[PDB]
Amino acid sequence: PVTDVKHDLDTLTLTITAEFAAPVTRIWQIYADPRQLEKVWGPPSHPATVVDHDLRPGGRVTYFMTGPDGEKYAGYWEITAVDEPHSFSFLDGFADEDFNPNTDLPVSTNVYTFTEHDGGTRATYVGTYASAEALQQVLDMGVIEGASSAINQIDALLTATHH
């Protein structure tokens, strides 16, 4: 589950921390396998699609998601670094259905880090923004709700027992 959310005003960062009851190698595969990434991003009420996916430096991930209110939006990752299974880094942008930038927002820079924590995994997702205004606008779009949902979906995948 989610264990911390921090908006650092001094660094223009939004950091979400999670703890998962599975090994780092397992969590890595959530992001490395586009069908698993699509799964955790798309619970029944908020469908997602991972369109293109190439988790290697210079690669791209392109996706559709359903926002809190039901609005479809699109986004893309430009992968800048990959260090399996501990970390990957990328630039993220918002886009239209064709994956063309469709807002006045610059990209954010992102580093995901997965480390061993009690035989399980601590995941730290750090997003760095161009300005306070940009970050505020993304917060208002519901970024934290979406990130929390994905984290909870990952939790659900890690156990064979259901509710």
Side-chain angles (χ1 to χ4, degrees), residues 63-65 72-76 93-100 102:
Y63 57 79
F64 299 132
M65 296 177 59
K72 189 179 194 170
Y73 68 99
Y76 59 93
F94 294 111
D96 65 20
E97 190 86 7
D98 297 329
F99 301 112
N100 302 129
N102 68 338

PDB file of all heavy atoms in Angstrom, residues 63-65 72-76 93-100 102:
ATOM      1  N   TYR A  63       0.359   5.403 -23.398  1.00  0.00           N
ATOM      2  CA  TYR A  63      -0.759   4.830 -22.647  1.00  0.00           C
ATOM      3  C   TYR A  63      -2.016   5.693 -22.649  1.00  0.00           C
ATOM      4  O   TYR A  63      -1.957   6.924 -22.818  1.00  0.00           O
ATOM      5  CB  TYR A  63      -0.340   4.596 -21.189  1.00  0.00           C
ATOM      6  CG  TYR A  63       0.152   5.847 -20.501  1.00  0.00           C
ATOM      7  CD1 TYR A  63      -0.741   6.791 -20.004  1.00  0.00           C
ATOM      8  CD2 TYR A  63       1.515   6.102 -20.387  1.00  0.00           C
ATOM      9  CE1 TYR A  63      -0.284   7.952 -19.390  1.00  0.00           C
ATOM     10  CE2 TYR A  63       1.978   7.255 -19.768  1.00  0.00           C
ATOM     11  CZ  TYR A  63       1.078   8.167 -19.272  1.00  0.00           C
ATOM     12  OH  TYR A  63       1.541   9.317 -18.670  1.00  0.00           O
ATOM     13  N   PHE A  64      -3.151   5.035 -22.461  1.00  0.00           N
ATOM     14  CA  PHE A  64      -4.401   5.714 -22.150  1.00  0.00           C
ATOM     15  C   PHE A  64      -4.783   5.371 -20.726  1.00  0.00           C
ATOM     16  O   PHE A  64      -4.611   4.232 -20.290  1.00  0.00           O
ATOM     17  CB  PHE A  64      -5.535   5.257 -23.073  1.00  0.00           C
ATOM     18  CG  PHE A  64      -5.292   5.523 -24.527  1.00  0.00           C
ATOM     19  CD1 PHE A  64      -5.502   4.526 -25.469  1.00  0.00           C
ATOM     20  CD2 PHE A  64      -4.863   6.763 -24.952  1.00  0.00           C
ATOM     21  CE1 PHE A  64      -5.296   4.771 -26.819  1.00  0.00           C
ATOM     22  CE2 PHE A  64      -4.652   7.015 -26.297  1.00  0.00           C
ATOM     23  CZ  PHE A  64      -4.865   6.020 -27.231  1.00  0.00           C
ATOM     24  N   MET A  65      -5.325   6.356 -20.017  1.00  0.00           N
ATOM     25  CA  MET A  65      -5.831   6.125 -18.679  1.00  0.00           C
ATOM     26  C   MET A  65      -7.191   6.777 -18.547  1.00  0.00           C
ATOM     27  O   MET A  65      -7.575   7.616 -19.368  1.00  0.00           O
ATOM     28  CB  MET A  65      -4.888   6.700 -17.623  1.00  0.00           C
ATOM     29  CG  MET A  65      -3.515   6.059 -17.581  1.00  0.00           C
ATOM     30  SD  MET A  65      -2.473   6.885 -16.372  1.00  0.00           S
ATOM     31  CE  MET A  65      -3.431   6.641 -14.887  1.00  0.00           C
ATOM     32  N   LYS A  72     -10.984  10.210 -20.352  1.00  0.00           N
ATOM     33  CA  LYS A  72      -9.831   9.541 -20.934  1.00  0.00           C
ATOM     34  C   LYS A  72      -8.738  10.564 -21.133  1.00  0.00           C
ATOM     35  O   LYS A  72      -8.981  11.673 -21.607  1.00  0.00           O
ATOM     36  CB  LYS A  72     -10.191   8.917 -22.275  1.00  0.00           C
ATOM     37  CG  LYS A  72      -9.093   8.007 -22.839  1.00  0.00           C
ATOM     38  CD  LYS A  72      -9.522   7.403 -24.173  1.00  0.00           C
ATOM     39  CE  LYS A  72      -8.624   6.249 -24.581  1.00  0.00           C
ATOM     40  NZ  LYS A  72      -9.205   5.528 -25.759  1.00  0.00           N
ATOM     41  N   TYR A  73      -7.528  10.212 -20.738  1.00  0.00           N
ATOM     42  CA  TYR A  73      -6.393  11.010 -21.165  1.00  0.00           C
ATOM     43  C   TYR A  73      -5.268  10.124 -21.656  1.00  0.00           C
ATOM     44  O   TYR A  73      -5.304   8.912 -21.500  1.00  0.00           O
ATOM     45  CB  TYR A  73      -5.935  11.999 -20.089  1.00  0.00           C
ATOM     46  CG  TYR A  73      -5.336  11.363 -18.872  1.00  0.00           C
ATOM     47  CD1 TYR A  73      -3.959  11.282 -18.715  1.00  0.00           C
ATOM     48  CD2 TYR A  73      -6.146  10.843 -17.879  1.00  0.00           C
ATOM     49  CE1 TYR A  73      -3.406  10.693 -17.577  1.00  0.00           C
ATOM     50  CE2 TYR A  73      -5.620  10.268 -16.760  1.00  0.00           C
ATOM     51  CZ  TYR A  73      -4.254  10.193 -16.607  1.00  0.00           C
ATOM     52  OH  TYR A  73      -3.748   9.606 -15.472  1.00  0.00           O
ATOM     53  N   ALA A  74      -4.300  10.734 -22.315  1.00  0.00           N
ATOM     54  CA  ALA A  74      -3.207   9.987 -22.885  1.00  0.00           C
ATOM     55  C   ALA A  74      -1.899  10.557 -22.385  1.00  0.00           C
ATOM     56  O   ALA A  74      -1.809  11.717 -21.987  1.00  0.00           O
ATOM     57  CB  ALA A  74      -3.278  10.039 -24.405  1.00  0.00           C
ATOM     58  N   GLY A  75      -0.873   9.731 -22.402  1.00  0.00           N
ATOM     59  CA  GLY A  75       0.416  10.172 -21.920  1.00  0.00           C
ATOM     60  C   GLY A  75       1.496   9.320 -22.533  1.00  0.00           C
ATOM     61  O   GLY A  75       1.219   8.303 -23.182  1.00  0.00           O
ATOM     62  N   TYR A  76       2.738   9.747 -22.354  1.00  0.00           N
ATOM     63  CA  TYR A  76       3.856   8.978 -22.864  1.00  0.00           C
ATOM     64  C   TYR A  76       5.055   9.137 -21.953  1.00  0.00           C
ATOM     65  O   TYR A  76       5.228  10.163 -21.302  1.00  0.00           O
ATOM     66  CB  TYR A  76       4.214   9.414 -24.295  1.00  0.00           C
ATOM     67  CG  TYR A  76       4.572  10.881 -24.386  1.00  0.00           C
ATOM     68  CD1 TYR A  76       5.890  11.300 -24.284  1.00  0.00           C
ATOM     69  CD2 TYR A  76       3.589  11.846 -24.533  1.00  0.00           C
ATOM     70  CE1 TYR A  76       6.220  12.647 -24.344  1.00  0.00           C
ATOM     71  CE2 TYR A  76       3.909  13.190 -24.589  1.00  0.00           C
ATOM     72  CZ  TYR A  76       5.225  13.583 -24.504  1.00  0.00           C
ATOM     73  OH  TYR A  76       5.541  14.924 -24.567  1.00  0.00           O
ATOM     74  N   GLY A  93       4.960  13.046 -20.389  1.00  0.00           N
ATOM     75  CA  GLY A  93       4.159  14.116 -20.955  1.00  0.00           C
ATOM     76  C   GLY A  93       2.708  13.727 -21.181  1.00  0.00           C
ATOM     77  O   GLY A  93       2.402  12.552 -21.357  1.00  0.00           O
ATOM     78  N   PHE A  94       1.823  14.718 -21.172  1.00  0.00           N
ATOM     79  CA  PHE A  94       0.406  14.511 -21.468  1.00  0.00           C
ATOM     80  C   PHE A  94       0.162  14.671 -22.955  1.00  0.00           C
ATOM     81  O   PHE A  94       0.829  15.475 -23.613  1.00  0.00           O
ATOM     82  CB  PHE A  94      -0.457  15.520 -20.710  1.00  0.00           C
ATOM     83  CG  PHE A  94      -0.416  15.342 -19.222  1.00  0.00           C
ATOM     84  CD1 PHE A  94       0.197  16.285 -18.414  1.00  0.00           C
ATOM     85  CD2 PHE A  94      -0.979  14.220 -18.632  1.00  0.00           C
ATOM     86  CE1 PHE A  94       0.239  16.120 -17.043  1.00  0.00           C
ATOM     87  CE2 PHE A  94      -0.939  14.051 -17.261  1.00  0.00           C
ATOM     88  CZ  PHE A  94      -0.325  15.004 -16.467  1.00  0.00           C
ATOM     89  N   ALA A  95      -0.809  13.926 -23.484  1.00  0.00           N
ATOM     90  CA  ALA A  95      -1.050  13.921 -24.927  1.00  0.00           C
ATOM     91  C   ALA A  95      -2.507  13.670 -25.315  1.00  0.00           C
ATOM     92  O   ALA A  95      -3.335  13.298 -24.479  1.00  0.00           O
ATOM     93  CB  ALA A  95      -0.149  12.882 -25.607  1.00  0.00           C
ATOM     94  N   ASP A  96      -2.802  13.874 -26.599  1.00  0.00           N
ATOM     95  CA  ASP A  96      -4.109  13.571 -27.145  1.00  0.00           C
ATOM     96  C   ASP A  96      -4.169  12.104 -27.568  1.00  0.00           C
ATOM     97  O   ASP A  96      -3.256  11.340 -27.273  1.00  0.00           O
ATOM     98  CB  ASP A  96      -4.482  14.548 -28.280  1.00  0.00           C
ATOM     99  CG  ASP A  96      -3.570  14.433 -29.501  1.00  0.00           C
ATOM    100  OD1 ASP A  96      -2.899  13.396 -29.663  1.00  0.00           O
ATOM    101  OD2 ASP A  96      -3.568  15.383 -30.321  1.00  0.00           O
ATOM    102  N   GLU A  97      -5.246  11.711 -28.230  1.00  0.00           N
ATOM    103  CA  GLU A  97      -5.440  10.304 -28.572  1.00  0.00           C
ATOM    104  C   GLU A  97      -4.336   9.787 -29.500  1.00  0.00           C
ATOM    105  O   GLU A  97      -4.059   8.586 -29.543  1.00  0.00           O
ATOM    106  CB  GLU A  97      -6.813  10.113 -29.221  1.00  0.00           C
ATOM    107  CG  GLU A  97      -7.221   8.654 -29.390  1.00  0.00           C
ATOM    108  CD  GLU A  97      -7.900   8.074 -28.166  1.00  0.00           C
ATOM    109  OE1 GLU A  97      -8.177   8.837 -27.218  1.00  0.00           O
ATOM    110  OE2 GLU A  97      -8.171   6.852 -28.153  1.00  0.00           O
ATOM    111  N   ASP A  98      -3.718  10.697 -30.250  1.00  0.00           N
ATOM    112  CA  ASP A  98      -2.673  10.331 -31.210  1.00  0.00           C
ATOM    113  C   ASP A  98      -1.276  10.373 -30.613  1.00  0.00           C
ATOM    114  O   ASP A  98      -0.278  10.209 -31.324  1.00  0.00           O
ATOM    115  CB  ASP A  98      -2.722  11.276 -32.412  1.00  0.00           C
ATOM    116  CG  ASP A  98      -4.024  11.174 -33.176  1.00  0.00           C
ATOM    117  OD1 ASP A  98      -4.625  10.074 -33.202  1.00  0.00           O
ATOM    118  OD2 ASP A  98      -4.460  12.199 -33.743  1.00  0.00           O
ATOM    119  N   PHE A  99      -1.226  10.617 -29.310  1.00  0.00           N
ATOM    120  CA  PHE A  99       0.015  10.815 -28.545  1.00  0.00           C
ATOM    121  C   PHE A  99       0.803  12.062 -28.918  1.00  0.00           C
ATOM    122  O   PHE A  99       2.011  12.131 -28.692  1.00  0.00           O
ATOM    123  CB  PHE A  99       0.884   9.549 -28.523  1.00  0.00           C
ATOM    124  CG  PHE A  99       0.171   8.375 -27.935  1.00  0.00           C
ATOM    125  CD1 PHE A  99      -0.189   7.295 -28.720  1.00  0.00           C
ATOM    126  CD2 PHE A  99      -0.208   8.394 -26.609  1.00  0.00           C
ATOM    127  CE1 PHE A  99      -0.875   6.221 -28.170  1.00  0.00           C
ATOM    128  CE2 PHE A  99      -0.905   7.326 -26.053  1.00  0.00           C
ATOM    129  CZ  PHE A  99      -1.244   6.250 -26.844  1.00  0.00           C
ATOM    130  N   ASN A 100       0.105  13.059 -29.451  1.00  0.00           N
ATOM    131  CA  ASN A 100       0.702  14.371 -29.636  1.00  0.00           C
ATOM    132  C   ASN A 100       0.449  15.242 -28.411  1.00  0.00           C
ATOM    133  O   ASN A 100      -0.678  15.324 -27.931  1.00  0.00           O
ATOM    134  CB  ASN A 100       0.153  15.052 -30.892  1.00  0.00           C
ATOM    135  CG  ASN A 100       0.392  14.233 -32.144  1.00  0.00           C
ATOM    136  OD1 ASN A 100      -0.525  13.979 -32.927  1.00  0.00           O
ATOM    137  ND2 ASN A 100       1.622  13.774 -32.311  1.00  0.00           N
ATOM    138  N   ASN A 102      -0.798  17.823 -26.030  1.00  0.00           N
ATOM    139  CA  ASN A 102      -2.024  18.590 -26.179  1.00  0.00           C
ATOM    140  C   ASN A 102      -2.312  19.539 -25.010  1.00  0.00           C
ATOM    141  O   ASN A 102      -3.449  19.998 -24.839  1.00  0.00           O
ATOM    142  CB  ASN A 102      -3.219  17.662 -26.417  1.00  0.00           C
ATOM    143  CG  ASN A 102      -3.553  16.830 -25.205  1.00  0.00           C
ATOM    144  OD1 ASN A 102      -2.707  16.613 -24.335  1.00  0.00           O
ATOM    145  ND2 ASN A 102      -4.794  16.347 -25.138  1.00  0.00           N
TER     146      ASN A 102
END
